[PDB]
C-alpha cells in the first residue's frame, strides 16, 4: 500500500528554535498527508491535513509543507510542552497508513541528579523481603549509569530500573533503581550504595547508607 517512512525517529531542539520532522511516502500521495501529534500519555490530536491545512485551533507555529513523496512538519518557538511523538499519515487511498512517529526531545542545559537511597521498609522486612530504593531526580541529559555496590562489590543482579520520560515543565528526566534482596542477604551485609555516573561530573555521584540517626 502506500508506505509512509519517517527518519529521524528522535529529534532535539532547544526552546525557541525550529525543528522540522521529515516524512516520506512510497508513491505520489498527491498532497494527502495528515500530521497527528501524540502527547506522552494522551491520545493523538490532528494537527494539519492536506499537508498544510491546520485544524481548528492548532497554532500557526506548526507548519506543514511537502509535495510528491516528500513532506515535512515544522514547529517554530518550540515550547517545553511540545515534547511529543509526531506521526505522518497518508490520506489519498485506503488503507490509511501512518509513519512510525518521531519523538521530539527539548534540548535543555545540564542538571545534576538529586540522588537519594532508601533502606528496606520495616514492614517489608517482616514479609522476609529487603529492597533498597534509589531515586535519581531531575537530571539532564538522559544518560546516567547507576551501579549498586554492596559491601564494595558491584552488585549487578536483582535491579529494576525505571525512567520518567522528559518533563513537560522543566525538560529533565528521573529514574529509579530498585535492588531487591532477601532479608538474609540484607542482614549478611552492611554498606549499600547507589553510585551514578553522569555528564555533570568526573566524580561518581555516590549515595550510601546504613541506618543512623538524624
Amino acid at each position: 500500500d502506500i508506505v509512509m517512512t519517517q527518519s529521524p525517529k528522535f529529534m532535539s531542539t532547544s526552546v525557541g528554535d525550529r525543528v522540522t520532522i521529515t516524512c516520506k511516502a512510497s508513491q505520489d500521495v498527491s498532497t494527502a498527508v495528515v500530521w497527528y501529534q501524540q502527547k506522552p500519555g494522551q491520545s493523538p490530536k490532528l494537527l494539519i491535513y492536506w499537508a498544510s491545512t491546520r485544524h481548528i485551533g492548532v497554532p500557526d507555529r506548526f507548519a506543514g509543507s511537502g509535495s510528491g513523496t516528500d513532506y515535512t512538519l515544522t514547529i517554530s518557538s518550540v515550547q517545553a510542552e511540545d515534547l511529543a511523538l509526531y506521526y505522518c499519515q497518508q490520506h489519498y487511498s485506503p488503507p490509511w497508513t501512518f509513519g512510525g512517529g518521531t519523538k521530539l526531545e527539548i534540548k535543555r542545559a545540564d542538571a545534576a541528579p538529586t540522588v537519594s537511597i532508601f533502606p528496606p521498609s520495616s514492614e517489608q522486612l517482616t514479609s522476609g523481603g529487603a529492597s533498597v530504593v534509589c531515586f535519581l531526580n531531575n537530571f539532564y541529559p538522559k544518560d546516567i549509569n547507576v551501579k549498586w555496590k554492596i559491601d564494595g562489590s558491584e552488585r549487578q543482579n536483582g535491579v529494576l530500573n525505571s525512567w520518567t520520560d522528559q518533563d513537560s515543565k522543566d525538560s529533565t528526566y528521573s529514574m529509579s533503581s530498585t535492588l531487591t534482596l532477601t532479608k538474609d542477604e540484607y542482614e549478611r551485609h552492611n554498606s549499600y550504595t547507589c553510585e551514578a555516573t553522569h555528564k555533570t561530573s568526573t566524580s561518581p555521584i555516590v549515595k550510601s547508607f546504613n541506618r543512623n540517626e538524624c
Partner: protein, 221 residues
Amino acid sequence: QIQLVQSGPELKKPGETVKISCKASGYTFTNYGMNWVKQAPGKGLKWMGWINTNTGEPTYGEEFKGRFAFSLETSASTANLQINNLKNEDTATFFCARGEDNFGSLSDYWGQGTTVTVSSAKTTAPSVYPLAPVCGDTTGSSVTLGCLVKGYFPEPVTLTWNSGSLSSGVHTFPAVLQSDLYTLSSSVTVTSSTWPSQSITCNVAHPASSTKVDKKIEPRG
C-alpha cells in the same frame, strides 16, 4: 463538545473475547463513522478499519479481517470493537477515532484508549511501603521521601500523595513487570518545614484487586 469516552482497560487470558465500547458525545453519530486504530506497545499506530455508522457496514484492514468485529449500539451512540479468540500478541491500546469523512481518512477527535493485557497471570493486590529517609538533606532544606508499590497484577495503580493535594515535586515512575508482577515507586520532595510536622500520605488504589491503601510515611529516623 465532542467526547469519545472508551471502556476501561481489560485483562483476559488467551482464547477469550473482549468487547470494547466507544460512547460518542457532541456530534450526530450518524453523519460520522468510526475508525478503530491499534497502537501497539512498540510498533506505533495502525488503522484497523472503519464502520459506516449510518448503514452499519464495516471495513476491516486486511490485518484485522477475521477475529475482529465492529458493531454499534446506534441507539446509544456507541461503537464497539470485539476481538475474539484473543491472541497473546493483541496486548496494545485501541482507540476509537471519529472519521471526518467517508472512510475515515481523517481522524479528527480520538477517544482515550482502552488497553488490553492478554495474560494468563492472576491478579495480585499490591504491597505499599512507606520509604522514609535515613536523612541526608536531599537538596537545601528539602526532604525527599517515597512509596514502593510492589507485587501486583494487572496494571494500572493510582498513586496520589495526600489525595492529590501534593502535586509539586512528585515523580511517579512507570511500573515495570518482572516476569509475573509489577513494581512502581514515586518520590515526593517537601521542605523540611512540611514533614515530619505535616502528615504526608501515599494513597494507593489497585482497582483490579479492590485495594486502596493509605501509608503514612512515618519519620522513622
